[PDB]
Design an enzyme around this catalytic site. Structure first.
Site, PDB file in Angstrom:
ATOM      1  N   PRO A 119      36.461  46.332  44.447  1.00 12.41           N
ATOM      2  CA  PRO A 119      35.684  46.948  43.370  1.00 12.41           C
ATOM      3  C   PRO A 119      34.533  46.052  42.949  1.00 12.41           C
ATOM      4  CG  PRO A 119      37.715  46.011  42.532  1.00 12.41           C
ATOM      5  CD  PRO A 119      37.853  46.091  44.029  1.00 12.41           C
TER       6      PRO A 119
ATOM      7  N   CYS B 250      31.430  46.329  40.115  1.00 11.70           N
ATOM      8  CA  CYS B 250      30.674  46.947  39.030  1.00 11.70           C
ATOM      9  C   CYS B 250      29.189  46.969  39.350  1.00 11.70           C
ATOM     10  CB  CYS B 250      30.881  46.171  37.729  1.00 11.70           C
ATOM     11  SG  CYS B 250      32.424  46.530  36.882  1.00 11.70           S
TER      12      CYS B 250
ATOM     13  N   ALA C 147      35.418  48.774  38.681  1.00 11.64           N
ATOM     14  CA  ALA C 147      36.233  48.888  37.479  1.00 11.64           C
ATOM     15  C   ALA C 147      35.722  50.068  36.651  1.00 11.64           C
ATOM     16  CB  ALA C 147      36.152  47.597  36.671  1.00 11.64           C
TER      17      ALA C 147
ATOM     18  N   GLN D 163      39.400  51.462  41.059  1.00 14.17           N
ATOM     19  CA  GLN D 163      40.069  50.513  40.187  1.00 14.17           C
ATOM     20  C   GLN D 163      39.891  51.002  38.754  1.00 14.17           C
ATOM     21  OE1 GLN D 163      38.173  46.760  38.936  1.00 14.17           O
ATOM     22  NE2 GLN D 163      39.924  45.686  39.833  1.00 14.17           N
TER      23      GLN D 163
ATOM     24  N   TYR E 187      40.798  40.471  31.596  1.00 14.38           N
ATOM     25  CA  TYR E 187      40.648  41.702  30.836  1.00 14.38           C
ATOM     26  C   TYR E 187      41.973  42.027  30.150  1.00 14.38           C
ATOM     27  CZ  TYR E 187      36.323  41.800  33.448  1.00 14.38           C
ATOM     28  OH  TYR E 187      35.109  41.443  33.989  1.00 14.38           O
TER      29      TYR E 187
ATOM     30  N   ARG F 269      45.378  44.650  40.841  1.00 14.51           N
ATOM     31  CA  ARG F 269      44.730  43.369  41.069  1.00 14.51           C
ATOM     32  C   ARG F 269      45.304  42.509  39.946  1.00 14.51           C
ATOM     33  NH1 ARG F 269      38.367  42.147  42.764  1.00 14.51           N
ATOM     34  NH2 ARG F 269      39.083  40.666  44.364  1.00 14.51           N
TER      35      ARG F 269
ATOM     36  N   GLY G 216      33.092  41.491  49.503  1.00 16.38           N
ATOM     37  CA  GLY G 216      32.240  42.063  48.481  1.00 16.38           C
ATOM     38  C   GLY G 216      30.743  41.874  48.582  1.00 16.38           C
ATOM     39  N   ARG G 217      30.260  40.711  48.157  1.00 17.02           N
ATOM     40  CA  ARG G 217      28.824  40.459  48.177  1.00 17.02           C
ATOM     41  C   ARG G 217      28.152  40.656  49.531  1.00 17.02           C
ATOM     42  NH1 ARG G 217      29.370  35.024  44.728  1.00 17.02           N
ATOM     43  NH2 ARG G 217      31.276  35.080  46.009  1.00 17.02           N
TER      44      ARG G 217
HETATM   45  C1  LIG Z   1      28.503  42.822  41.270  1.00 16.91           C
HETATM   46  C2  LIG Z   1      29.856  42.417  41.369  1.00 16.91           C
HETATM   47  C3  LIG Z   1      30.731  43.354  40.727  1.00 16.91           C
HETATM   48  C4  LIG Z   1      32.193  43.079  40.756  1.00 16.91           C
HETATM   49  N1  LIG Z   1      33.017  44.038  40.141  1.00 16.91           N
HETATM   50  C5  LIG Z   1      34.366  43.930  40.108  1.00 16.91           C
HETATM   51  C6  LIG Z   1      35.201  44.942  39.473  1.00 16.91           C
HETATM   52  O1  LIG Z   1      34.673  45.904  38.968  1.00 16.91           O
HETATM   53  N2  LIG Z   1      36.596  44.707  39.500  1.00 16.91           N
HETATM   54  C7  LIG Z   1      37.288  43.510  40.123  1.00 16.91           C
HETATM   55  O2  LIG Z   1      38.410  43.376  40.112  1.00 16.91           O
HETATM   56  N3  LIG Z   1      36.459  42.574  40.727  1.00 16.91           N
HETATM   57  C8  LIG Z   1      35.135  42.714  40.750  1.00 16.91           C
HETATM   58  N4  LIG Z   1      34.299  41.793  41.359  1.00 16.91           N
HETATM   59  C9  LIG Z   1      34.823  40.615  42.050  1.00 16.91           C
HETATM   60  C10 LIG Z   1      34.744  41.131  43.618  1.00 16.91           C
HETATM   61  O3  LIG Z   1      35.649  42.245  43.776  1.00 16.91           O
HETATM   62  C11 LIG Z   1      35.167  40.105  44.634  1.00 16.91           C
HETATM   63  O4  LIG Z   1      36.555  39.675  44.412  1.00 16.91           O
HETATM   64  C12 LIG Z   1      34.208  38.886  44.538  1.00 16.91           C
HETATM   65  O5  LIG Z   1      32.832  39.260  44.720  1.00 16.91           O
HETATM   66  C13 LIG Z   1      34.553  37.793  45.579  1.00 16.91           C
HETATM   67  O6  LIG Z   1      34.364  38.360  46.999  1.00 16.91           O
HETATM   68  P1  LIG Z   1      33.007  38.084  47.802  1.00 16.91           P
HETATM   69  O7  LIG Z   1      32.872  36.582  47.974  1.00 16.91           O
HETATM   70  O8  LIG Z   1      33.257  38.814  49.120  1.00 16.91           O
HETATM   71  O9  LIG Z   1      31.871  38.668  47.072  1.00 16.91           O
HETATM   72  C14 LIG Z   1      32.755  41.864  41.433  1.00 16.91           C
HETATM   73  C15 LIG Z   1      31.772  40.921  42.071  1.00 16.91           C
HETATM   74  C16 LIG Z   1      30.386  41.075  42.110  1.00 16.91           C
HETATM   75  C17 LIG Z   1      29.624  40.066  42.772  1.00 16.91           C
HETATM   76  O1  LIG Z   2      35.604  38.040  39.632  1.00 14.44           O
HETATM   77  C1  LIG Z   2      34.865  38.847  39.095  1.00 14.44           C
HETATM   78  C2  LIG Z   2      33.351  38.747  39.043  1.00 14.44           C
HETATM   79  C3  LIG Z   2      32.609  39.677  38.435  1.00 14.44           C
HETATM   80  C4  LIG Z   2      33.248  40.857  37.784  1.00 14.44           C
HETATM   81  C5  LIG Z   2      32.526  41.887  37.122  1.00 14.44           C
HETATM   82  C6  LIG Z   2      33.205  42.963  36.536  1.00 14.44           C
HETATM   83  C7  LIG Z   2      34.624  43.041  36.593  1.00 14.44           C
HETATM   84  C8  LIG Z   2      35.366  42.033  37.245  1.00 14.44           C
HETATM   85  O2  LIG Z   2      36.744  42.110  37.311  1.00 14.44           O
HETATM   86  C9  LIG Z   2      34.670  40.934  37.840  1.00 14.44           C
HETATM   87  O3  LIG Z   2      35.483  39.977  38.471  1.00 14.44           O
END
Ligand SMILES: Cc1cc2nc3c(=O)[nH]c(=O)nc-3n(C[C@H](O)[C@H](O)[C@H](O)COP(=O)(O)O)c2cc1C
Ligand SMILES: O=c1ccc2cccc(O)c2o1
Ligand SMILES: Cc1cc2nc3c(=O)[nH]c(=O)nc-3n(C[C@H](O)[C@H](O)[C@H](O)COP(=O)(O)O)c2cc1C
Ligand SMILES: O=c1ccc2cccc(O)c2o1
Ligand SMILES: O=c1ccc2cccc(O)c2o1
Ligand SMILES: O=c1ccc2cccc(O)c2o1
Ligand SMILES: O=c1ccc2cccc(O)c2o1
Ligand SMILES: O=c1ccc2cccc(O)c2o1
Lengths: 359, 359
Positions: free
Chosen positions: B22, B24, B56, B98, B182, B230, B324-325
């Site tokens: 997920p 955002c 999320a 999520q 959260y 998660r 993700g990224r």
């Molecule tokens: C823009 C952005 C939005 C994210 N949104 C969520 C989210 O909504 N819920 C969640 O559990 N993690 C969220 N994460 C954390 C990512 O799911 C992921 O665990 C994190 O980017 C690490 O993986 P990566 O190195 O492949 O980016 C977000 C990360 C980024 C960069």
């Molecule tokens: O680890 C992270 C990084 C950014 C982020 C953003 C929204 C919700 C999340 O759960 C997030 O979790």
């Protein structure tokens, strides 16, 4: 870098010199585009490219290349493009569209479904039309029907209606498809045009269909929006010097006729040729056209390597660099290029929801 | 390669082990998603990933992290997801979502607009709720209101309604957001939970909100569709061994309670920590949870390097690799990975309109 310098043509300004050339998706139904195209195009617009030219869109049903080609031969077909155009603009990219007519290469299968002319008994097929009743050959053996003067008048009007529809749908850039062996290219080439009337024989007669179509479209296409065309300037058929000379002369007539930019390509009019494929191989020819016709140009084939795109612009071989397949592989190629060329804040080539996290 | 082997969980089969976690987008309005999300998600689904978990999505208005967060607190909000879910499925990817509640980290600015708690006089803000009236600190100084038993009952029901809506919208995978500081995570952590009633104090009491919410959601979520969550299993706050032991025990209770897979992460409950950031740094912890709780898992952070993803799977540290990224940078990362790992017909990780030309 030069690749990321804006470009202004008429009243339109592109945020950079990256153009996504028209690329058929073969996903339309009876000419109607759908969510495949919407997501595909909107995604590309968000990728960063300054200009996004929508795939060859048929001006008439028989002008489609395949049963999956997009069309704009009715107002209902044009309406389907409206949400897409608005999504491209929302992303900051300029929405353009290539209107076309496949000529003798029409009524063919999708590339991954044979890529050849559709069988005579296939209910999806149709009669092809062209300047003369001569087949392309190879995988496209179907002999087209020789167009009558009325067919010519009708197709020209189809191009006018298509341009009028593109205009009203919100497109800010139009490209007439006079290349790759389709109808327009086939009227110019002596290989495919054996006519003895006003549309065949001499240079002026072979140029007539293209010039008249451009002039007719010009009447409905806004003066303040770029009016362009794609044209094959040589075939690599052993008649290159003679063909290029005539093609450059036609380019001069296009400029005089209001053409703002020319997308330089190869003719693909016949199969028996020897094209020297290579990364940015079109660069030298594009530059010659730009110089001898004093007209802005773009070209493509292998410019997906950032450094090559940058070099072509710095050498003034092109005004815009068209990158196709690299964008199918990665819709965010513009971002990859910005990084590769050391552009400051390269991540902001993309929208905030992405850029913020990539910087 | 292991990265491209399918995965079956309950009645759902993922075409490969690549999961888009997920993420955002902060592009929703009053919780309503729009064409930003549609194109974003559909584009990612076409990129090749086997599973796409939507960002999320708030179970209640005050559960949003920011004014740009998606919500599913009403049937109208759920309806907005329907076309997106159908586009993800059309692309061959499994649509997941999520559902969450930001707790004390709610009512904050978008990341590129301050990333901090919204000012008291800003008309976009709202009162935050949490287990106890204690602020996160740092950039999130707002003190939340201590939840009453009725608030707890209401939020649990909000999660149930959200899951019911996700189900009816067509989602085939659900993830309860009990991580990243959260609401859910904050009930488990002693840092944020100072309650003395049935929802605070002991391990059982701190686990209660999470277990009851999972059980309540289980009543409306189809048995044949993966039920996941998660959860941050450690904080890197100097209490790691003790925290991990309790987290693994809760994971065992989740499994017994019907959880099919656990997305392993860090708590982010408080700011004063020392997280050892690094490529695939979560691998070892994820593996320990998988082993000691005998539950399938996924994790993330730095797995965007094909070889790392492949290695994590081969070592059985994870069942699915979340990337993700890398997907924000290139929506077709799956294709890039297939090439990098020498997968046969790597281009066909993408749809025909792209694959045909890239092979
Ligand atoms: C823009 C952005 C939005 C994210 N949104 C969520 C989210 O909504 N819920 C969640 O559990 N993690 C969220 N994460 C954390 C990512 O799911 C992921 O665990 C994190 O980017 C690490 O993986 P990566 O190195 O492949 O980016 C977000 C990360 C980024 C960069
Ligand atoms: O680890 C992270 C990084 C950014 C982020 C953003 C929204 C919700 C999340 O759960 C997030 O979790
Ligand atoms: C799938 C696909 C569709 C294409 N569709 C069109 C089209 O509709 N009109 C046109 O003039 N050229 C078309 N072309 C040619 C491309 O515009 C471009 O000139 C070519 O791919 C070479 O650039 P590249 O090496 O960056 O891909 C297409 C090419 C591919 C691979
Ligand atoms: O050069 C090309 C290659 C593929 C193609 C496909 C449709 C229309 C065209 O004009 C094309 O041109
Ligand atoms: O070239 C033209 C001719 C007429 C016209 C009318 C309205 C708006 C325009 O942009 C126009 O442009
Ligand atoms: O070029 C033209 C010709 C006619 C016309 C009519 C309405 C709007 C336009 O933008 C127009 O543009
Ligand atoms: O777990 C359940 C309970 C009831 C039910 C009813 C219809 C379809 C399902 O998939 C169901 O799944
Ligand atoms: O798990 C459940 C519970 C109730 C229910 C009702 C209708 C359809 C479903 O799929 C359901 O699934």
């Amino acid at each position: 870098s030069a690749l990321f310098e804006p470009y202004t043509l008429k009243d339109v300004t592109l945020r950079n010199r990256i153009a996504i050339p028209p690329m058929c998706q073969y996903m339309a139904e009876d000419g109607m585009i759908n969510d495949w195209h919407h997501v595909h195009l909107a995604g590309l617009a968000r990728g960063g490219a300054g200009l996004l030219v929508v795939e060859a869109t048929a001006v008439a049903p028989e002008g489609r290349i395949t049963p999956g080609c997009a069309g704009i031969w009715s107002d209902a077909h044009a309406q389907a493009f409206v949400p897409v155009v608005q999504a491209i603009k929302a992303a900051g990219s300029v929405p353009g569209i290539q209107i076309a007519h496949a000529g003798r290469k029409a009524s063919a299968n999708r590339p991954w479904e044979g890529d050849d002319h559709i069988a005579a008994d296939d209910t999806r097929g149709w009669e092809t039309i062209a300047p003369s009743a001569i087949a392309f050959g190879a995988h496209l053996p179907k002999v087209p029907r020789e167009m009558t003067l009325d067919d010519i008048a009708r197709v020209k009007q189809d191009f006018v209606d298509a341009a009028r529809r593109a205009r009203d749908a919100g497109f800010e850039w139009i490209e007439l498809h006079f290349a790759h062996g389709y109808l327009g290219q086939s009227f110019f080439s002596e290989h495919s045009n054996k006519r003895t009337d006003a549309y065949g024989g001499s240079f002026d007669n072979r140029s007539r269909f293209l010039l008249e179509t451009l002039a007719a479209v010009r009447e409905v296409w806004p003066e303040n929006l770029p009016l362009t065309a794609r044209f094959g300037v040589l075939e690599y058929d052993g008649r290159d010097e003679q063909t290029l000379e005539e093609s450059i002369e036609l380019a001069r007539r296009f400029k005089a006729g209001g053409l703002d930019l020319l997308s330089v390509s190869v003719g693909f009019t016949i199969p028996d040729t020897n094209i020297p494929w290579g990364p940015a191989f079109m660069g030298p020819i594009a530059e010659r056209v730009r110089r001898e016709a004093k007209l802005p140009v773009t070209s493509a084939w292998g410019f997906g390597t950032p450094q090559l795109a940058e070099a072509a612009l710095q050498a003034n071989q092109l005004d815009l660099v068209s990158v196709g397949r690299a964008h199918l592989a990665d819709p965010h190629w513009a971002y990859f290029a910005a990084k590769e060329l050391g552009v400051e804040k390269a991540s902001w080539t993309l929208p905030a929801p992405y850029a913020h996290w990539l910087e």
